[PDB]
From Swiss-Prot:
This is Cytoplasmic dynein 1 heavy chain 1. Cytoplasmic dynein 1 acts as a motor for the intracellular retrograde motility of vesicles and organelles along microtubules. Dynein has ATPase activity; the force-producing power stroke is thought to occur on release of ADP. Plays a role in mitotic spindle assembly and metaphase plate congression. Homodimer. The cytoplasmic dynein 1 complex consists of two catalytic heavy chains (HCs) and a number of non-catalytic subunits presented by intermediate chains (ICs), light intermediate chains (LICs) and light chains (LCs); the composition seems to vary in respect to the IC, LIC and LC composition. The heavy chain homodimer serves as a scaffold for the probable homodimeric assembly of the respective non-catalytic subunits. The ICs and LICs bind directly to the HC dimer and dynein LCs assemble on the IC dimer. Interacts with DYNC1LI1; DYNC1LI1 and DYNC1LI2 bind mutually exclusive to DYNC1H1. It comes from Homo sapiens. It is found in: Cytoplasm, Cytoskeleton. It comes from the Eukaryota. Belongs to the dynein heavy chain family. It is linked to Charcot-Marie-Tooth disease, axonal, type 2O: An axonal form of Charcot-Marie-Tooth disease, a disorder of the peripheral nervous system, characterized by progressive weakness and atrophy, initially of the peroneal muscles and later of the distal muscles of the arms. Charcot-Marie-Tooth disease is classified in two main groups on the basis of electrophysiologic properties and histopathology: primary peripheral demyelinating neuropathies (designated CMT1 when they are dominantly inherited) and primary peripheral axonal neuropathies (CMT2). Dynein heavy chains probably consist of an N-terminal stem (which binds cargo and interacts with other dynein components), and the head or motor domain. The motor contains six tandemly-linked AAA domains in the head, which form a ring. A stalk-like structure (formed by two of the coiled coil domains) protrudes between AAA 4 and AAA 5 and terminates in a microtubule-binding site. A seventh domain may also contribute to this ring; it is not clear whether the N-terminus or the C-terminus forms this extra domain. Signal peptide: none annotated.
Length: 57
């Protein structure tokens, strides 16, 4: 379970980097609605991952 927690944290920070990169891409593209939807989906996945991490902690 501890190993699973660490894997969840690593996936959380990797997806955080991905969300920041996609948000920068959307800001550059401000061809925009699709990027907005992708960023919102990544943010929702990050929120679910953070909820799982909080439950694990």
């Amino acid at each position: 379970t501890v190993d699973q927690v660490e894997e969840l944290r690593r996936d959380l920070r990797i997806k955080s980097q991905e969300l920041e990169v996609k948000n920068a891409a959307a800001n550059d593209k401000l061809e925009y609605a699709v990027l907005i939807s992708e960023a919102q989906a990544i943010k929702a996945d990050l929120a679910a991952v953070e909820a799982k991490v909080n439950r694990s902690t």
